[PDB]
Amino acid sequence: SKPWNRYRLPTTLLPDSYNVTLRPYLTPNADGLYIFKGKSIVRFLCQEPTDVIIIHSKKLNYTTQGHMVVLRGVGDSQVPEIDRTELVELTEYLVVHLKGSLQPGHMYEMESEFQGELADDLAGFYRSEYMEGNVKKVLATTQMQSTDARKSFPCFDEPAMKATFNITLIHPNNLTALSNMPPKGSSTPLAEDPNWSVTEFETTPVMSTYLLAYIVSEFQSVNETAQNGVLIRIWARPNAIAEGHGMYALNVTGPILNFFANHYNTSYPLPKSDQIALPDFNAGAMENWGLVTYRENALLFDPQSSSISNKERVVTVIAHQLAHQWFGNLVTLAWWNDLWLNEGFASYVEYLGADHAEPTWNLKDLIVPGDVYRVMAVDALASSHPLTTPAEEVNTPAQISEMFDSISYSKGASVIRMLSNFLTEDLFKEGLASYLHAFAYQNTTYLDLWEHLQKAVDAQTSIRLPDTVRAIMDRWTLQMGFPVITVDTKTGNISQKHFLLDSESNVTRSSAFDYLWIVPISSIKNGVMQDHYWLRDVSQAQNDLFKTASDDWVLLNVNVTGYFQVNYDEDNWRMIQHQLQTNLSVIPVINRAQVIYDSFNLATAHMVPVTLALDNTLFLNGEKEYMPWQAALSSLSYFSLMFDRSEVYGPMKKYLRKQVEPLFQHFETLTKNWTERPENLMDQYSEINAISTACSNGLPQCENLAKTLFDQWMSDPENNPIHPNLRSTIYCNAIAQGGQDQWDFAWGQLQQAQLVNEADKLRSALACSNEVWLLNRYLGYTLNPDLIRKQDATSTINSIASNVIGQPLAWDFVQSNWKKLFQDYGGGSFSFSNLIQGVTRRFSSEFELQQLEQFKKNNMDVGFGSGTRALEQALEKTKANIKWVKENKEVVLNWFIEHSS
Amino acid sequence: AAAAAAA
Ligand SMILES: *[C@@H]1O[C@H](CO)[C@@H](O[C@@H]2O[C@H](CO)[C@@H](O)[C@H](O)[C@H]2NC(C)=O)[C@H](O)[C@H]1NC(C)=O
Numbered sequence: 092s093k094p095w096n097r098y099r100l101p102t103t104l105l106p107d108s109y110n111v112t113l114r115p116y117l118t119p120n121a122d123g124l125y126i127f128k129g130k131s132i133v134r135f136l137c138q139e140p141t142d143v144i145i146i147h148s149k150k151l152n153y154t155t156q157g158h159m160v161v162l163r164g165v166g167d168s169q170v171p172e173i174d175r176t177e178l179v180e181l182t183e184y185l186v187v188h189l190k191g192s193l194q195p196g197h198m199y200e201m202e203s204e205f206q207g208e209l210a211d212d213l214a215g216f217y218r219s220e221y222m223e224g225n226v227k228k229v230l231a232t233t234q235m236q237s238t239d240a241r242k243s244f245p246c247f248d249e250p251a252m253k254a255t256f257n258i259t260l261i262h263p264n265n266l267t268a269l270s271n272m273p274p275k276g277s278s279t280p281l282a283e284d285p286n287w288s289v290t291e292f293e294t295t296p297v298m299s300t301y302l303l304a305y306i307v308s309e310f311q312s313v314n315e316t317a318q319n320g321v322l323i324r325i326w327a328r329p330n331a332i333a334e335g336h337g338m339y340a341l342n343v344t345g346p347i348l349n350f351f352a353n354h355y356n357t358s359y360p361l362p363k364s365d366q367i368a369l370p371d372f373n374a375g376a377m378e379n380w381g382l383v384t385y386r387e388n389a390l391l392f393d394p395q396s397s398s399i400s401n402k403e404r405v406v407t408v409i410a411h412q413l414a415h416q417w418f419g420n421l422v423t424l425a426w427w428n429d430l431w432l433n434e435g436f437a438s439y440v441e442y443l444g445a446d447h448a449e450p451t452w453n454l455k456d457l458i459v460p461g462d463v464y465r466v467m468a469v470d471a472l473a474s475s476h477p478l479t480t481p482a483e484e485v486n487t488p489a490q491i492s493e494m495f496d497s498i499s500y501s502k503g504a505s506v507i508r509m510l511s512n513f514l515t516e517d518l519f520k521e522g523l524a525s526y527l528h529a530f531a532y533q534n535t536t537y538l539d540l541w542e543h544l545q546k547a548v549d550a551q552t553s554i555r556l557p558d559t560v561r562a563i564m565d566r567w568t569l570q571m572g573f574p575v576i577t578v579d580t581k582t583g584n585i586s587q588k589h590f591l592l593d594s595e596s597n598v599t600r601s602s603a604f605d606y607l608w609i610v611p612i613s614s615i616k617n618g619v620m621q622d623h624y625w626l627r628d629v630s631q632a633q634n635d636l637f638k639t640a641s642d643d644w645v646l647l648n649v650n651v652t653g654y655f656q657v658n659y660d661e662d663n664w665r666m667i668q669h670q671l672q673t674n675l676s677v678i679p680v681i682n683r684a685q686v687i688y689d690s691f692n693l694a695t696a697h698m699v700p701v702t703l704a705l706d707n708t709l710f711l712n713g714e715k716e717y718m719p720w721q722a723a724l725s726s727l728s729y730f731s732l733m734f735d736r737s738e739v740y741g742p743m744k745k746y747l748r749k750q751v752e753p754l755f756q757h758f759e760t761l762t763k764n765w766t767e768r769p770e771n772l773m774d775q776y777s778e779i780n781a782i783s784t785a786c787s788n789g790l791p792q793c794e795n796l797a798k799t800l801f802d803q804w805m806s807d808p809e810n811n812p813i814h815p816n817l818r819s820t821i822y823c824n825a826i827a828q829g830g831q832d833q834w835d836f837a838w839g840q841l842q843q844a845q846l847v848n849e850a851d852k853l854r855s856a857l858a859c860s861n862e863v864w865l866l867n868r869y870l871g872y873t874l875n876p877d878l879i880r881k882q883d884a885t886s887t888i889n890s891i892a893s894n895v896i897g898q899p900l901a902w903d904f905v906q907s908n909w910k911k912l913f914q915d916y917g918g919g920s921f922s923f924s925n926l927i928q929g930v931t932r933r934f935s936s937e938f939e940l941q942q943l944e945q946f947k948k949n950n951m952d953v954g955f956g957s958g959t960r961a962l963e964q965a966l967e968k969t970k971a972n973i974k975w976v977k978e979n980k981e982v983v984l985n986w987f988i989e990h991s992s
Numbered sequence: 993a994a995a996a997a998a999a
């Protein structure tokens with residue numbers, strides 16, 4: 092085959108350095124087209140003789156004099172004549188056919204002039220539109236991740252083909268130009284038209300194309316100079332900056348950078364750090380080296396209207412991107428098949444960095460609910476996949492995009508955290524530093540990190556492993572899934588097997604290891620840490636560490652550092668339960684949660700009865716801390732979803748009202764009648780969940796608090812008396828208790844809300860009305876652009892659907908208005924998969940299945956488009972719900988009746 | 993891009 096028909100670049104030519112000049116035109120032409128122009132020179136070195144230059148180019152028109160490029164030799168090298176230049180669209184190449192061969196060791200310069208659309212598409216150099224007062228503003232910014240650098244200028248657009256870049260922006264003279272590096276100096280006027288200015292930037296270090304960034308805008312900054320002279324700036328809309336919304340980001344950035352320089356034993360490798368808040372940046376955040384982009388709600392924080400979870404989100408998303416400024420940007424994985432190592436690593440250490448900035452918050456705990464249990468839901472499926480993918484199976488831009496998923500990020504994080512824990516952090520940090528120093532400004536595979544970690548292991552005598560780092564990690568990276576570890580405490584027998592939530596699932600993906608792992612197993616016996624154990628690649632083993640007397644108990648996987656779930660014989664479970672009932676503080680808070688998370692998953696898998704899982708919630712009446720309650724609430728939301736229209740609900744509600752009342756009472760006092768929030772994040776999180784659980788389960792005292800506060804707000808609209816933390820519950824419950832007075836007031840507040848996060852809470856709360864007529868009127872608003880944003884339409888319908896009373900109304904609304912398909916799937920794709928998912932979520936009867944089939948019977952024209960697969964998922968999901976409800980209804984009913992007094 | 997990773 093011809094090389095220009097292969098998706099991977101040749102290795103015959105390697106880039107040295109680039110000059111790139113970009114010029115966005117932020118005024119459309121007389122047709123509404125926005126464009127940018129560019130000029131580039133790439134200097135590259137011939138490694139092997141070749142008579143063709145293949146470089147990436149996507150959606151660029153060339154206006155170069157002559158052929159699409161001009162080609163020169165560097166110094167006194169001669170250059171062959173160009174035969175022709177062509178664009179090969181499929182593989183996204185510009186191809187320069189030469190009349191002779193380039194010579195090994197010679198350097199060449201290739202110059203081009205080009206232009207592209209400055210589209211509203213979040214790809215390459217693109218435009219972003221937003222409002223300042225009555226004025227529509229347009230800025231130019233970048234998103235190269237993963238294969239879009241080539242959409243802004245021709246380049247060898249693979250991550251290992253690193254080079255230095257000299258960026259120049261030509262821009263309106265009253266706008267600011269930003270790039271990876273500082274400007275060289277002040278801007279100078281463009282001679283052809285001094286309404287434009289030219290900003291040149293300092294040369295980048297040797298770096299990857301996917302990490303380039305350049306931005307032209309009206310933004311302003313808050314700034315700090317670190318003690319080492321590193322300039323730190325947070326950029327945002329002028330009104331956001333003036334409001335002070337960039338201050339929290341500024342506060343944490345300096346401490347995070349310092350943490351990482353030490354953690355990595357490597358100086359921050361750039362002269363400055365810019366971070367920018369972009370309105371409606373749907374990629375969320377991107378780690379461009381020296382110029383990190385964020386969506387506004389991810390970077391900005393308003394103390395007066397934002398909740399604590401909001402603050403947690405800002406500090407961790409910052410730590411994540413900053414983590415990459417070394418791991419990923421300084422040392423770069425050679426190919427997209429190893430993306431998991433890069434994103435998995437940042438997804439783990441974001442908690443470490445953030446913990447440094449907010450050390451009272453215990454942020455490191457949050458990886459357990461946030462990543463470990465989250466990803467275990469999808470990794471406990473037959474349709475999962477290994478972290479590792481052969482490089483030669485990842486070729487196309489679409490294949491590269493598929494690397495960015497939950498497994499890569501969250502299982503990547505879980506597995507790396509497990510690795511650091513079993514090596515110990517000190518030892519892990521030593522291998523990590525060695526890896527970074529050896530490969531700085533270069534590229535690696537995951538085997539390079541293992542090698543450097545093994546070097547650290549081999550240079551000490553304290554930590555001993557049952558095999559090499561690589562052999563151990565191969566079990567966690569070359570095969571999908573994870574084991575359930577089952578202990579029989581009467582014998583100390585211990586077994587492992589591939590855990591699937593569906594006990595009747597057929598696994599057809601084969602493992603080189605037969606789904607056996609090498610497993611690090613910490614344990615606690617009667618509240619005392621035991622010696623660490625390794626389960627080798629065997630189905631069963633035995634150790635006295637896991638053997639108990641019937642007044643003793645043992646509990647494995649302390650703090651859920653290991654990527655596995657744990658089952659015990661029923662006697663040990665009861666002992667654990669007893670301990671949790673009498674003195675819970677003897678079991679680490681994370682394990683108090685684990686008992687709940689694991690047992691509910693085990694019940695789903697038919698490995699324990701559902702009553703055993705429910706039994707594990709009984710201790711919660713004395714539980715004050717966030718996580719174990721969160722575990723219960725996450726595990727029970729499906730029960731609520733299946734049973735909230737059934738006879739099971741009263742007893743469930745009553746049971747939950749019983750469990751949560753003492754916690755509610757506790758915070759009542761602690762908060763001094765809800766006047767002051769608890770001090771640290773976990774306790775604030777616990778209060779939020781307690782209020783939520785209390786109110787939504789009809790605890791009179793909570794309902795009273797909600798009604799009082801909202802009435803107080805209504806009598807004095809400009810002085811909101813509800814703390815941001817509690818708003819979503821208080822607003823929802825108060826609207827639930829009230830009528831059109833409350834609803835119309837909240838709607839008024841929605842229509843004048845300036846801040847997205849307040850508007851979100853209001854939109855969600857309005858769906859909590861218990862008046863059919865208000866909900867139907869609200870549904871009638873969701874398709875009106877004047878009243879509900881397009882981007883918010885399905886979200887709103889979904890919130891209405893989640894109201895038991897709104898369920899039939901939303902479902903009727905969707906069926907009836909479905910012909911908004913030939914209206915929103917040609918103008919703006921309109922997340923239809925989420926809508927179907929949401930409104931059909933509750934379905935658990937044959938009757939509801941029949942409704943869904945009868946509704947589907949409209950394939951005749953219309954179709955479904957983006958949610959065609961989502962409908963099929965809904966039918967499969969309904970069958971699963973039907974079956975689960977039949978198996979569980981009776982047992983669950985009687986357990987709740989039994990335990991609600 | 994991205995992460996964090998909620999709970
Ligand atoms: C980008 O700018 C840098 C910095 O000015 C250029 O680096 C110079 O390049 C040549 C080698 O080709 C040397 O003679 C100089 O010593 C370099 N200077 C420095 C400070 O390193 C680089 O060539 C430019 N890139 C391109 C494509 O022109």
Ligand SMILES: *[C@@H]1O[C@H](CO)[C@@H](O[C@@H]2O[C@H](CO)[C@@H](O)[C@H](O)[C@H]2NC(C)=O)[C@H](O)[C@H]1NC(C)=O
Pocket residue numbers: 110132134200257
């Ligand atoms: C890439 O850009 C740099 C900066 O403009 C070029 O270097 C300059 O070249 C001009 C002449 O055109 C001289 O006046 C300066 O001495 C250079 N400036 C610096 C800072 O070195 C460089 O020639 C460009 N690279 C190529 C291959 O054209």
Ligand SMILES: *[C@@H]1O[C@H](CO)[C@@H](O[C@@H]2O[C@H](CO)[C@@H](O)[C@H](O)[C@H]2NC(C)=O)[C@H](O)[C@H]1NC(C)=O
Pocket residue numbers: 352353355356357358
């Ligand atoms: C990287 O790590 C090394 C090793 O810890 C650091 O060097 C040590 O610094 C302390 C001073 O606080 C000395 O007491 C040790 O003797 C040093 N050890 C060695 C081998 O030099 C070093 O400072 C770190 N570098 C960076 C950039 O973080």
Ligand SMILES: *[C@@H]1O[C@H](CO)[C@@H](O[C@@H]2O[C@H](CO)[C@@H](O)[C@H](O)[C@H]2NC(C)=O)[C@H](O)[C@H]1NC(C)=O
Pocket residue numbers: 105251252253425530533534535
């Ligand atoms: C990708 O990374 C490897 C290193 O992992 C680079 O190879 C090294 O290049 C340096 C010079 O920069 C040499 O000192 C080493 O001896 C090389 N190691 C090898 C070849 O194993 C490689 O250059 C990078 N690939 C590209 C295209 O830049």
Ligand SMILES: *[C@@H]1O[C@H](CO)[C@@H](O[C@@H]2O[C@H](CO)[C@@H](O)[C@H](O)[C@H]2NC(C)=O)[C@H](O)[C@H]1NC(C)=O
Pocket residue numbers: 453456649650679680681
């Ligand atoms: C299990 O996790 C907890 C955190 O939830 C760890 O407890 C923390 O440990 C460090 C140092 O001992 C302290 O800075 C924290 O204040 C501790 N918090 C509490 C509540 O004790 C605990 O050390 C972990 N256990 C293991 C074996 O790693």
Ligand SMILES: *[C@@H]1O[C@H](CO)[C@@H](O)[C@H](O)[C@H]1NC(C)=O
Pocket residue numbers: 126127152206207208209
């Ligand atoms: C690129 O060229 C095609 C016609 O060859 C044209 O339709 C398109 O508008 C051009 N785009 C730009 C941004 O100049």
Ligand SMILES: *[C@@H]1O[C@H](CO)[C@@H](O)[C@H](O)[C@H]1NC(C)=O
Pocket residue numbers: 263265266309
């Ligand atoms: C920049 O100049 C243009 C054209 O006069 C104007 O529309 C815009 O508001 C100015 N912006 C700033 C930040 O001064």
Ligand SMILES: *[C@@H]1O[C@H](CO)[C@@H](O)[C@H](O)[C@H]1NC(C)=O
Pocket residue numbers: 338339342392394
């Ligand atoms: C930033 O830091 C200052 C100094 O500690 C503090 O008073 C302020 O509350 C912080 N800003 C935010 C939004 O947290």
Ligand SMILES: *[C@@H]1O[C@H](CO)[C@@H](O)[C@H](O)[C@H]1NC(C)=O
Pocket residue numbers: 579582584633
């Ligand atoms: C425990 O393991 C041993 C070792 O093979 C086996 O003989 C025994 O039957 C096992 N007992 C139980 C109760 O699992």
Ligand SMILES: *[C@@H]1O[C@H](CO)[C@@H](O)[C@H](O)[C@H]1NC(C)=O
Pocket residue numbers: 618674676677
């Ligand atoms: C509970 O256990 C902890 C740890 O052993 C101990 O400090 C505390 O005194 C115990 N409290 C009670 C009421 O037994």
Ligand SMILES: [Zn+2]
Pocket residue numbers: 378411412415433434437993994995
């Ligand atoms: Zn990331």
